[PDB]
Amino acid sequence: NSQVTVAVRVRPFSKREKTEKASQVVFTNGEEITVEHPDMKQVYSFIYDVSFWSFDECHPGYASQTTVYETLAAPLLDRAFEGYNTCLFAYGQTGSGKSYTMMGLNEEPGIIPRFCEDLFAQIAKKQTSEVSYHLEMSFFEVYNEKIHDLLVCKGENGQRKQPLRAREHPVSGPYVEGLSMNVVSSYSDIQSWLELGNKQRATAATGMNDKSSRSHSVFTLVMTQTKTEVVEGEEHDHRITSRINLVDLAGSERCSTAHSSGQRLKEGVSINKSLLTLGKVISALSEQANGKRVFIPYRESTLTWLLKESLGGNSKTAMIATVSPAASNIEETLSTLRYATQARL
Amino acid sequence: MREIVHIQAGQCGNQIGAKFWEVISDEHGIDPTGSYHGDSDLQLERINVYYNEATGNKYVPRAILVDLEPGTMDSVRSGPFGQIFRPDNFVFGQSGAGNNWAKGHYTEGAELVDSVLDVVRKESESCDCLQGFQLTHSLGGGTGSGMGTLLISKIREEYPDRIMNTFSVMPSPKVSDTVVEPYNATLSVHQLVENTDETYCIDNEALYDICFRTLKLTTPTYGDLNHLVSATMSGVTTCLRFPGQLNADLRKLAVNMVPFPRLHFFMPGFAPLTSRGSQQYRALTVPELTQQMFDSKNMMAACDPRHGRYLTVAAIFRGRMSMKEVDEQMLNVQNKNSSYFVEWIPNNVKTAVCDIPPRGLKMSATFIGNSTAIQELFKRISEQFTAMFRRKAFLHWYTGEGMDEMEFTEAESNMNDLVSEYQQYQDATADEQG
Amino acid sequence: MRECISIHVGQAGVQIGNACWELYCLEHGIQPDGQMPSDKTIGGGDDSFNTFFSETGAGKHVPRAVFVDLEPTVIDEVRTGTYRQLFHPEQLITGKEDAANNYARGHYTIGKEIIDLVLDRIRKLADQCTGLQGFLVFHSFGGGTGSGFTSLLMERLSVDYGKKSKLEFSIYPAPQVSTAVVEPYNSILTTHTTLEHSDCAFMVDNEAIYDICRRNLDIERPTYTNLNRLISQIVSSITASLRFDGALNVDLTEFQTNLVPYPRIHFPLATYAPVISAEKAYHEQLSVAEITNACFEPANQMVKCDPRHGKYMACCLLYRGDVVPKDVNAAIATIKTKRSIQFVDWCPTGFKVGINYQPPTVVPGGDLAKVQRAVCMLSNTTAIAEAWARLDHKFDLMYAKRAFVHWYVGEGMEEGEFSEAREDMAALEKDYEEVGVDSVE
Ligand SMILES: CC(=O)O[C@H]1C(=O)[C@@]2(C)[C@H]([C@H](OC(=O)c3ccccc3)[C@]3(O)C[C@H](OC(=O)[C@H](O)[C@@H](NC(=O)c4ccccc4)c4ccccc4)C(C)=C1C3(C)C)[C@]1(OC(C)=O)CO[C@@H]1C[C@@H]2O
Ligand SMILES: Nc1nc2c(ncn2[C@@H]2O[C@H](COP(=O)(O)OP(=O)(O)OP(=O)(O)O)[C@@H](O)[C@H]2O)c(=O)[nH]1
Ligand SMILES: Nc1nc2c(ncn2[C@@H]2O[C@H](COP(=O)(O)OP(=O)(O)O)[C@@H](O)[C@H]2O)c(=O)[nH]1
Ligand SMILES: Nc1ncnc2c1ncn2[C@@H]1O[C@H](COP(=O)(O)OP(=O)(O)O)[C@@H](O)[C@H]1O
């Protein structure tokens, strides 16, 4: 069956922060995470299935990138070859280390490059001249409950963001029309597509940061292992297929502080509704793993509706939340750790 | 300035509207010339919620007729209250849907929807503030199912901030009136579930049984059935028009009747209903009304709440009442009938009161309810549906008009998932210890 | 002179104000047209009482009030009623649409587009006032306007006016009775925001007042026009020393002091014992002892909670009419001799006491009777924590499933505010349990 694996990663202080000398609010005791308000009145504790401490190297249990890949992502690539689907969530507010854990810098690579390179270097080993592995990639977004494709090059006009629609095949399940799928042979082709997509992804210079991710983003890889019938008849026979999804979600965007009106407010509403439905889905899946028959509300959002076969049944889901230990972002860290907290059982 | 736009689509919709605009025009004092001939002064305060003003202090309703055959147009015009509607709002065509959801959603409705939207925009932009929309439509046939749902989908896109109520006449268990009811109903639910906020389900048979067992009517025409539907329509929109002690609206009821956005299919009902002879031998008090409203034999949905659990109910009272006698009564129901309700919602009842009742009664009441018994309304269709779809019975008349088999399976799966969502909350199980 | 601004937010607020000002207009002698008839006598005078009514040179007295509802249905009954010529025409409707019992709407979506226009009027009234003291707010935990808009306004007034008293008179939610499914959310969300700004919140409940109107007044079918008349008497007893002469006078800052030990336990109750009919106006002496004992009976509380399940921390006792302090001292001695009425060890000084000479006025069409002596008891008791334990549990039921949350998110809110508020209330429960503990070093 399918349980989830929620993890937390505390980013270290920026040199700007320890030069300005921001104070520390997020502490740990190996297992648990603790938040202590600067007033030192209330202290809240959070337990998770895994906890990553990237605060300082000299600490015991330092959480580098290679121990995030080996801990969360790699057991999903392992389940791929077994013939099952997998999804990797990535939640986090701006200035918390989402793109350092997932994509990474030129050095210190995140989950995407390590994952892809291990996949390619392992199919290079496993292929026998009687088995063959074919990979097919896709990359799309969600904006106000509308599906947009990114890898297609958009000439400048009003905008060519065609609102594609989702359908439900009886066997294959929910899918996306017009999805420009592409082929891949090694990791140096995914970099190009992802750069070309992230350039066209939606952004806005809201109050928090010069560029915030105002849209979700699903990056899918479909593998097909063809092994041959020679009972008597050659293949095109046996295609065990697996979908591996890496989703880069957006922020919750409390609108009390952010006096947001119009399009930014509508984007915030859509993001928060999607995240609520996703939380409901994860909680229902954990309950199901714990022996309770329940109804997983997939059809209340597109993100949950298209990934239905990738977070259900014989599937393995993973989630990583990013937090800052600074005292100017306590109100964000609290909501993040409390969004993650309702997935752990 | 909480303005409503009534859209009437099909025979059912127009025949309910021709009775509803007789009920509201009476509740506000309008005559078939469009002129105020009333007595009070509250009738004029919030007449803007349904009507618009003209030159000679005339009041023209904000109605939009949609039907694709001229027969109902003439019935409205050649009628009692026909010369108050705007002729530029009698939108219609010829060669109707043919009891087909495809002809009225892709072929013939697409050739006329622009003409309806051009009137909708005119009547919505002439409103100071808009509360929502209002559609009366029979799914089971064509036009009301297809050309209604398409208008819903195109208004929700133009107005994804407003309410879109749908007062629908669903098909009945025993006796059908169209052979292709299952397909069309399934394809309408697939559009309403995704593009509605509060949809009210009505069934001819529940209303026949009301007319026979309560009202003691032997031969009730449809003007009698629609006389019950209009009553509930007016009950929902009384707080916006008239004043009251504890008020409500469409948004507040929808907030307090929809825990999850998909479960917005409700059972309407109205009290006090009685036979003309058994009026002298009853008392007009709140408990009699509460006993009449929560009675299974007073519903309109043809689905018994004894076979399910109420998730959330509403009660819009009209008259000079006492709020203590509403609180006590609506607490008594939760306690005496705890099994018929949900535990993770402590108080399932909403109350609203208006200080101005219906023209002939000292007191009135209107009842909405969200029950798991309407499961039965869909589980039947999905059983009628798949059988036919297991043989491809009447499908070549829909494919020919530009449809695919996938659009059927999608709707079927959506309905069955709705069934599961309602059935998850009707087996009362307990917690670890508490 | 002294001045107190009243802010009636929501349906409940307006329907309480329409009785409160009905009462004030009679206590002082103002007709609904604003024109005092017995300004014949003034030759100076101060009976154009400046605590509530601003006078203008034409012989007219306009109240220091503000109305806002997010819906015209209630305010437009004032414009069309008997008191249409009294209030300044700035009775602020903004009722293109109401809060739909959503805190998310009355805080940001529709709560804004207004609050500038409310603050511009409060500023206009304050500048017309010299020694302003206090903001009497009137609202309801359970609706969207009263919940969110009041939170917003109290956030703003804590910045614009700073350290000035803010007394909330709030309709508390009842355990069993409820006219809405989303009071458990709005109540907690309003407490989370108002708790850091308000200074004393006087709570009431409709169920208790129904029980009173049944048992004492002999009304089996009562409506809001009976309850709000009693709430008006509570406010008048609170606001009597600032208008009429007395022996022991009480300013608004004295409730903020004698009844708030710690800045988060400022949620007291209210009580008004002589709620007897004109029939039972006879057959009873109606002395200070009988009344003071009635106010400590758990049945005549205006909030549904048994203080036998808790401990009193402070209690103000405001009396009107022919009272002598010897009687109050004897009564308090009788109450302190009783063992069912427990107190905290750290509060041996108990009761605040106040006396005013002018007795209450009877409204025509009312249910109260002319009584020579009146009393109002406002007590802080730990027992109300049990009520907070109820609301916090309902929340826990219909929030585990995230029911009704998409309506709040759809109007500008986040899934984390609920957790924040629930944790603040769980902290307040522990803060109510701590003080009950007996002191040991
Ligand atoms: C002397 C007297 O009391 O006559 C009553 C009457 O006998 C009864 C039976 C009326 C009567 O209604 C019916 O018999 C009936 C027939 C078909 C379908 C539904 C009802 C009545 O016709 C119906 C009529 O109701 C109204 O007038 C309301 O305004 C109603 N609107 C209209 O009837 C109406 C019809 C056409 C044109 C304009 C208005 C209404 C109800 C709810 C909301 C808005 C309006 C009333 C009180 C009566 C008669 C006349 C006998 C009842 O009607 C209602 C809705 O309450 C039927 O049961 C109630 C109980 C009443 O006692
Ligand atoms: N005591 C008393 N309570 C009232 C009165 N009117 C409404 N209430 C209570 O108010 C609660 C709901 O809050 P409302 O006042 O209706 O909400 P609102 O302020 O009008 O805000 P909206 O929801 O936007 O209309 C209910 O539980 C009622 O019991 C009244 O006149 N007197
Ligand atoms: N309650 C009610 N239902 C009706 C009435 N007229 C028709 N119906 C129902 O509505 C359906 C009529 O379908 P309709 O849309 O008129 O077919 P169309 O003319 O092709 O659009 C039938 O299934 C009837 O059960 C009416 O006056 N009252
Ligand atoms: N574990 C870590 N060690 C060192 N630096 C880190 C770590 N995590 C995050 N950072 C720093 O924090 C920044 C994260 O920015 P980024 O996460 O890309 O913003 P956003 O979250 O808005 O995408 C990077 O510049 C990186 O240098």
Ligand SMILES: [Mg+2]
């Ligand atoms: Mg209101």
